Amino acid sequence: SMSVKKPKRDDSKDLALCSMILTEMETHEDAWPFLLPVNLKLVPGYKKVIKKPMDFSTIREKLSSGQYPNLETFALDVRLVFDNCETFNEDDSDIGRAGHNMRKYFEKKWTDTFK
């Protein structure tokens, strides 16, 4: 609170560390469903069902242009990709399995890098 500050975690390297984690997800072989925005004019249901679409290229653009205030807002957009994937796909499908795999892959890198 006012004039009572908790000790400050060092955040100076967060931009480059997030950028690196994103690079690794972009090159994972199961990233293909998540590389580009879903086409809302061509894909049934998506625009109406998925209220906040997110994809790796949109995250890369936001990261490169100063649109993430901090670590946590970046992790929220990455998790959003995989939450959208669960909402729109059966677990028992190739895309549904790709989402589960990419999420596991992300959270491990997250813990290792920061926790």
* Cα 53 from Cα 36, distance rounded (Å): 11
DSSP 35: S
CB of 41 to ligand 53B, least distance (A): 12
Listed ranges 22-30, 56-64, 69-77, 85-93: which one lies at the site for ligand 53B (CB under 6 A): 85-93
* Cα 102 from Cα 47, distance rounded (Å): 23
Q: Does 105 bind ligand 53B (CB under 6 A)?
A: no
Contact 33, 53 (CB under 8 A): no
Q: Which of residues 24-43 bind ligand 53B (CB under 6 A)?
A: 38, 43
Q: Does 80 bind ligand 53B (CB under 6 A)?
A: no
Nearest-CA neighbor of 34 among 44, 51, 20, 22?
Answer: 22
Residue from the set 58, 88, 100, 101 that interacts with ligand 53B by CB under 6 A: 88
By rule CB under 6 A, what count of residues binds ligand 53B?
Answer: 6
Q: Does 89 bind ligand 53B (CB under 6 A)?
A: yes
Contact 105, 113 (CB under 8 A): no
| Chain residues that interact with ligand 53B, rule: CB under 6 A | 38, 43, 85, 88-89, 95
